[PDB]
Amino acid sequence: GEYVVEKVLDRRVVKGKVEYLLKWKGFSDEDNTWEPEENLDCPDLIAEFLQSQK
């Protein structure tokens, strides 16, 4: 399914591909998942994470 994301918590690079750790709206932090970037439709939240990295 498609769900609303609260925040992008982290990013990792594995096998030449980018994945993000996502906090899902209305779900426990125990339900955070790593998702391939192609799954994401949250550009403003990715922009927030990269700026927090600087």
Partner: peptide, 9 residues
Amino acid sequence: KQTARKSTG
């Protein structure tokens, strides 16, 4: 809205 698809399985 900021959404994403959650990988199933």
